[PDB]
Design a protein around this nucleic acid. Structure first.
Length: 49
DNA sequence: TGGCCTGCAACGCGGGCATCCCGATGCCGCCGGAAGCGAGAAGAATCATAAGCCGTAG
């Protein structure tokens, strides 16, 4: 549900590509932080296979 | 293929023995230098105290 309980939001997306490993992100929490380099799609598919 | 180790035989010189002359040396007495590291001082490696940007939030 949305902020006022009037709409619906999908929890996760039915994706086919691991965008976390392909592009990544760089965010910082209140006490934590993360940083992930991008990668190549073909080698990720090869590793998954 | 060329050179080296060794046996056989001939030659020579020095090991051993003693001693006379000799050179170091242990000891004694007097003098020199270096060590003694402890301490003062200087240089350097390391630790402690500000920003700049990475991207959403106010």
């Amino acid at each position: 549900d949305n902020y006022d309980g009037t709409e619906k939001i999908p929890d996760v997306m039915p994706t086919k590509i691991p965008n976390l490993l392909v592009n990544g992100s760089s965010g910082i929490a209140v006490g934590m932080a993360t940083n992930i380099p991008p990668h190549n799609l073909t080698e990720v598919i090869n590793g998954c296979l």
